[PDB]
């Protein structure tokens, strides 16, 4: 009762007669109805009004355009009042008093509101007679009843509006939608996606305007949708779209939202979808194209696809989709080299003999990035690293590692287990990264991969399963000890295995002569419980070097470092095999029965001494078994005397280990010294470095086994020189310094089992 529904929202108010408190009631002038209901503001204003004052109403036509709604924020019921009588000559300073109430849902009679129930808000009018007013309404009463009453105070005259009741929510005018962009999606379909206001509590239907506007073909296609974002169908090239969207309530009546500034989106003569593609090496891609030529769409049966404007694509890969949509599908494509500052391939679409300058981009990124890494001997730190200086196709992306490992192991089956935990790894000057894991589960199987983010998308390298306990690098063995054996002649290597790992190990020894550069020899031991080895070497005590490495037996893990080399020490091993080749000389008168005989011999050479023999000795044997021993020191010449008929002498070598075993012998005897068997000797210088000696002999009774020839210079008293000759040969060659001018002698002696007889002496070359 006493309420006129606002059907529709638009209504025009006109005030007609029924000066401090002169109030005039105003009514709506509709097409067929005229309602005049008194408001609950003034009840005692029934005062007599003079007839003359009505003449003022002739000059004052109180016509007003009053409207309002609830804004999308559901906070303010801003109301607008416009003055139809736009008289610029006189401006009225009128004040608006608004009484609004929001009664609650009461089930006990629809009682008329009393005085003071409404709220007073002084409504603000602009300079140009337009009044905007703020009405705070609680959100819990949006579906409830709201009452309006307006009082206009213009020049001391009050104008009264009727009571208006309407639901705020059913005629809410939304805000102009924003957050809109116009790009071609990946299926040849423009999307008009606007961030439709969230403060609206009800679904909204939107009127959306656009068209196909071109230079020649012009048509208008205005539409109405209901979703917060729409997706048009079959965009054609060379057609401007003037899109503009406004909102309103979808269910029941409502007020359209504010018109926004029109958005213009113009596509060029060739349209590609998708325009940019990011794909790794070895995959398959696809494209699309629509062409317009002098305002006419080219049929799909005469279109050819190019590549960098360099080589035409073979026709085998072309596919037909519709009247004006084509398809090109690259098969097993390679990596795109960087051509100058351009890091992408351009793919064109064109017909006949003309190709437009618009192109579709195509990037290709390689993803085979290698990761491989250790576990240090203490089973704590795990260190690894991946290259990025070879692979180009980058310098345009940030990179990051990932983890995934929980139970015991890995390398079972895809997928990469999309749960992952990033970890940051640093950079080093070598050109490769690295980063450290600790503490590490030695028996947990990590799954690693590299993720490449890029300006267009994301890519993932193939994973890798790594188990730390199986990639350990052991520490090199300590206390390496090489020592030449005793009484045998072998090289002995001894050592001790590293504490980690606790698996079985194999060792690889490498050894050789000590020196600046050596051609070392390798040897393998395949037993964990063997820890010392013995090997043969050619020499005896030439110093040697040895080094050792360790590895796990089953082939897992990596090799260790080379140990600190441990050189040996030189020291003698055993007794010499052979004594000296010792010769006699006599310096005394022949008439003497006592002869001062001097024994002379060369110093022994290394391998005969096996290393070193520090002492020599002489031993004797008379016919009466007279035997004795005496030291000579490091003197290689000794002398003694001989008077008894038959006396043998022996020269021995004594060193650190013991006396020699196999040694030569020789006996002196005057009685058999009177025997000669050599008849003639000849010597001749072949040249300055070769002399030939030959001899003709005679037989005897005793057994002859070796000769001896003694030569010395005759111009100067040089050292006596001799060398062994076997009795078997009859000719010999002598190779040393010689000059034919000076004079030399020779003296060949036959020696039997018990002495030397008469010699053969020659004073010149024959």
């Amino acid at each position: 009762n006493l309420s006129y529904p606002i059907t529709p929202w638009r209504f025009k108010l006109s005030c007609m007669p029924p000066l401090s408190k002169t109030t005039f009631h105003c009514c709506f002038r509709s097409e067929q109805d005229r309602n005049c209901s008194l408001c609950a503001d003034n009840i005692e204003g029934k005062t007599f009004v003079s007839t003359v004052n009505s003449l003022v109403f002739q000059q004052i036509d109180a016509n007003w355009n009053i409207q309002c709604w609830l804004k999308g924020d559901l906070k303010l019921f801003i109301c607008y009042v416009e003055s139809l009588f736009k008289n610029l000559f006189r401006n009225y300073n009128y004040k608006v008093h608004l009484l609004y109430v929001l009664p609650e849902v009461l089930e006990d009679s629809p009682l008329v509101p009393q005085k003071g129930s409404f709220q007073m808000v002084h409504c603000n009018c602009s300079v140009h007679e337009c009044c905007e007013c703020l009405v705070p309404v609680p959100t819990a009463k949006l579906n409830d009843t709201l009452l309006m009453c307006l009082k206009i105070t213009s020049g001391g005259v009050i104008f009264q509006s009727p009571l208006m009741s309407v639901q705020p929510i059913n005629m809410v005018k939304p805000d102009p939608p924003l957050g809109l962009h116009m790009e071609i999606t990946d299926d040849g379909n423009l999307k008009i996606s606007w961030s439709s206001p969230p403060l609206v509590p009800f679904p909204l239907q939107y009127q959306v305007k656009y068209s196909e506007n071109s230079t020649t073909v012009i048509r208008e296609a205005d539409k109405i949708v209901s979703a917060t974002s729409l997706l048009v169908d079959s965009i054609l090239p060379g057609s401007s779209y003037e899109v503009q969207v406004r909102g309103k309530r979808l269910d029941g009546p409502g007020i359209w939202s504010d018109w926004s500034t029109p958005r213009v989106f113009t596509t060029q003569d060739v349209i590609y979808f998708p325009p940019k593609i990011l794909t790794s090496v070895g995959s398959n891609v696809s494209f699309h194209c629509i062409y317009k030529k002098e305002n006419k769409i080219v049929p799909s049966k005469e279109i050819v696809w190019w590549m960098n404007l360099a080589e035409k694509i073979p026709q085998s890969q072309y596919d037909v989709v519709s009247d004006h949509v084509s398809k090109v599908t690259f098969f097993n494509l390679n990596e795109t080299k960087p051509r100058g500052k351009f890091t992408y391939d351009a793919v064109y679409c064109c017909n006949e003999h003309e190709c437009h300058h618009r192109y579709a981009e195509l990037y290709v990124i390689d993803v085979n990035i290698n990761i491989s890494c250790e576990t240090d001997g203490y089973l704590t730190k795990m260190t690894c690293r991946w290259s990025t200086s070879t692979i180009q196709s980058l310098a345009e992306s940030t990179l990051q590692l990932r983890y995934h490992r929980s139970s015991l192991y890995c390398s079972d089956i895809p997928s990469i287990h999309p749960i992952s935990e990033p970890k940051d790894c640093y950079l080093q000057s070598d050109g490769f990264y690295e980063c450290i894991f600790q503490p590490i589960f030695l028996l947990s199987g990590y799954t690693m991969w590299i993720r490449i983010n890029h300006s267009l998308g994301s890519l993932d390298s193939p994973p890798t399963c790594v188990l730390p306990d199986s990639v350990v690098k052991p520490l090199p063995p300590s206390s390496v000890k090489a020592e030449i054996t005793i009484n045998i002649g072998l090289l002995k290597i001894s050592w001790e295995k590293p504490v980690f790992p606790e698996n079985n190990l194999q060792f690889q020894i490498r050894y050789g002569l000590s020196g600046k550069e050596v051609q070392w020899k390798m040897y393998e031991v395949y037993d964990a419980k063997s820890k010392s080895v013995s090997l043969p070497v050619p020499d005896l005590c030439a110093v040697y070097a040895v080094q050792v490495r360790c590895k796990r037996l089953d082939g897992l893990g990596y090799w260790s470092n080379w140990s600190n080399p441990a050189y040996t020490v030189v020291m003698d091993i055993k007794v010499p095999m052979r004594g000296p080749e010792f010769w006699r000389i006599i310096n005394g008168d022949t008439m003497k029965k006592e002869k001062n005989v001097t024994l002379l011999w060369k110093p022994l050479m290394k391998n005969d001494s096996l290393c070193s023999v520090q002492r020599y000795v002489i031993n004797h044997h008379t016919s009466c078994n007279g035997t004795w021993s005496e030291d000579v020191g490091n003197h290689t010449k000794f002398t003694f005397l001989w008077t008894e008929q038959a006396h043998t002498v022996t020269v021995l070598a004594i060193n650190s280990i013991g006396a020699s075993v196999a040694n030569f012998n020789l006996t002196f005897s005057w009685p058999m010294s009177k025997v000669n068997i050599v008849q003639s000797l000849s010597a001749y210088p072949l040249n300055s470095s070769c002399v030939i000696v030959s001899w003709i002999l005679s037989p005897s009774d005793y057994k002859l086994m070796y000769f001896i020839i003694e030569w010395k210079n005759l111009n100067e008293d040089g050292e006596i020189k001799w060398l062994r000759i076997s009795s078997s040969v009859k000719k010999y060659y002598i190779h040393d310094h010689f000059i034919p001018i000076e004079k030399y002698q020779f003296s060949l002696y036959p020696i039997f089992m018990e002495g030397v007889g008469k010699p053969k002496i020659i004073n010149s070359f024959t």
Binding site: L408, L442, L443, F500, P501
Partner: protein, 104 residues
Amino acid sequence: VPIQKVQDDTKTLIKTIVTRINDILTLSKMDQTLAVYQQILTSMPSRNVIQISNDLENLRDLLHVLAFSKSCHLPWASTEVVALSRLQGSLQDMLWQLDLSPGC
């Protein structure tokens, strides 16, 4: 995965853990023991102790794996020097008993 290689891994890891700690019958009882060792070892944040603990749960998970190998759904169950000593002692006890490979 084949089970015949598991016991070698058990022996290797138990030897490794006893060796590193020296540097400083039924399955349910086994698991509850190991579990209480984890708790009584968590209290000490020392670098050796934390890594020994982190190496203990690999043993525990492997123990669960070997329990499941025999089709047995195993239910889930001055101080630091002596603690480390008793850890080691229980460890060679575990080694000796798993040498015989008892039942569930």
